[model samples]
Structure formats: structure tokens, C-alpha cells
Target chain A: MKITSSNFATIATSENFAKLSVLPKNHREPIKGLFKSAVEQFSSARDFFKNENYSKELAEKFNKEAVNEAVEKLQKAIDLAEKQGIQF
Target chain B: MKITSSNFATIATSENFAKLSVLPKNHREPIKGLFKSAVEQFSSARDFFKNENYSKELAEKFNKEAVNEAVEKLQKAIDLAEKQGIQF
Candidate 1:
């Protein structure tokens, strides 16, 4: 099978059926995005494991960021799952 | 030497030299804070090393933040060390 990639010039002249055959996936499909964000948040959070010389104030701020990131992703995942009719 | 910790209402009588025996060290002392910030930024950044489901857009944004936080702390630390005649 042969594939025809769409170009601006081609789209300007006519609607490209070949281009329409493949659609861009919303890789930012909320759930995955949430997971990605959460992992990143937690990765830094792991650094504050009490032996990194982090003071109480710094630890508090870092922990808060982790919690915030977790909550942010959790909300996004829930919303996306609901939209897709997936059971939580 | 014996230490006298200061508490509220005790400063009413005298200049609280007992509390002045030792001053609180500024852990946020620019250089240390910068080092701390850099470690945290790189720690999370290591996760964004292309294996995660992070999209190009998200990755770009995260990279920018990492650079930004680095620059911010670096400048602060440089100024702090300069005032004390320290080298970077």
C-alpha cells in the first residue's frame, strides 16, 4: 500500500482524502497527560526523602508541589475517563 | 557554652542576648538554594528523557521551566556570593 502525505499546496487545491485517512491522535488524551504529569511531580518529590539536606521550609514547598501535581493530574484523568464512558 | 533559647514574652525585659547566642543560618543562602533547586530540577528532568508518554509540547514546556528555574536561582546565588566576595 502507498501513502500520500498532505501538504499545504495540496490542501489549498482540493480536500485531501489521503490525508483524511489518518488523523492525529490527541496524545494529550487527558488521562495519559495526567499520568505523565504525576510521574514528573513524584520524581522530584522523591528527592525530598529527608536525607538531601532539605530544610523544613524547602521540604514543605516541594511536598506541596507533589500534592498539587498529583491532584491536577487526578482531576484531568477523572474528567477524561468520564467523557469516554469508562468506569472509574 | 550553655545556651538559652528565646521564647515569646521573654524579650520584654532585656535585649535577649540569650537568643542572640546563635543566629538562624539562612539555608536559603543563595548558593545553597541554587544548588538545591538545580538538583530538584534535574531530578525530575531525568524522567523526561524521552521514554515517558510526554508529548512534544509538554516536553518543551517542561524543558523551558527547567531552564527558567535554573537561571533564577543561579542569578540569586551569584549576587549573594558576590556580596560576600565569593567566587562562582
Candidate 2:
């Protein structure tokens, strides 16, 4: 996928979809996968900021947005794991 | 304050209050302070897990809760900054 802003959204969605494939099969693995994916997305955002040479202002904005999204994704993953009767 | 689970809540609130004292004074300073506080809270949570020797399960739970709270604080800080006409 192209690494443009639009492509980032598409790639993110695709990544989440791929993680969902392991769900409902094993609570532990799938939930872990989800959290890992969220962290990966955050790292990718940082990489994008550095590689694109974003202005400091834009970099901070992107980083905050990325962290917020990652936290939400993690929350969803934990909620799902609990709903599935997973211990952690 | 004690560093027990109960005290953690109080400390968190106190930390946020300290951060807020900088607000409405300078947009840049206050917002930056807020973000730094959030990151510090996150680090504290991780330290809590390690120092307390939490099981992997409890550690994950605490970490997730910490991240959620930090993210919420950041969102509020960003909203306030934007409301005050801060550029970033």
C-alpha cells in the first residue's frame, strides 16, 4: 500500500481486520494480537512523522492522535478479552 | 501519600491538579505540562507493576487502565488548548 495519509487509514483498517481473524478462537492470543497491533500502529505513526520530516507542530499533533487511537484500540481489546471470560 | 492502590488514585488527582495550575496562563506551557504529566503517570503505572511484582494478568490490567486514564487526560488537555486558540 502507498504510504500516503489516505493509505495509512486503509492500511490501519486492513491490519485490524487481519487481527480479527484470530478472534473467538482463542481469547488470549487474539487479545494480545490486538494490543500488539495497536502499539505497532503507534510506532508506525512515529516513523511516518520522522520519515516525512513533519514540522514540530504537525509531529506533535500526529503523535497525540496516534497515542489516543492506540489507547482506544487497547481498551477495546481488553473489553473483548474480559467479555470472552479471559483472565487477562 | 502512600503508594498503595488507593493512594494511587489520590496521587493521580493531585498530579492533574498541579498540572492545571499552569493552565489559562500560557497555552503552550500548560498543554505541554499536561502531556508530560500524562506520560509520567504512564511510567509510574509501569513502575508500579514491576515494583509490586504483579502477575502478568494484573500487570496488563493495570497498564491498560493507566493508558486509558492518560489518554483521557490528554484529550481534555488538547480540547482545552484548542478552545484557548493554541495552534498545537
Task: List per-prediction Cα lDDT, in the order shown.
Answer: 0.35, 0.43
Question: RMSD for each model, in Å, please?
Answer: 28.1, 27.7
Q: Record all residue pairs in model 2 with backbone atoms less than 3 Å apart, i.e. clashing.
A: none
Q: What's each prediction's clash count?
A: 0, 0
Ten-residue region with minimum lDDT total, candidate 2 chain A: A1-10
Candidate 2, residue A67: the lDDT equals: 48
In candidate 2, what are the lDDT values of residues B29-73, reduced to their tens digit? 444454455446445545543544444445455555544443333
For residue A42, model 1's alpha carbon misses the true position, in angstroms, by: 38
Mark the regions of model 1 whose C-alpha exceeds 4 Å error after superposition. A1-54, B1-88
Question: What fraction of the true interface does each of the listed models get right, in terms of native contacts kept?
Answer: 0.00, 0.00
Model 1: lDDT of residue A74: 34
CAPRI accuracy category, model 2: incorrect
Cα lDDT tens digits for candidate 1, A2-56: 1112221222121322222233334213323333343344334334333333454
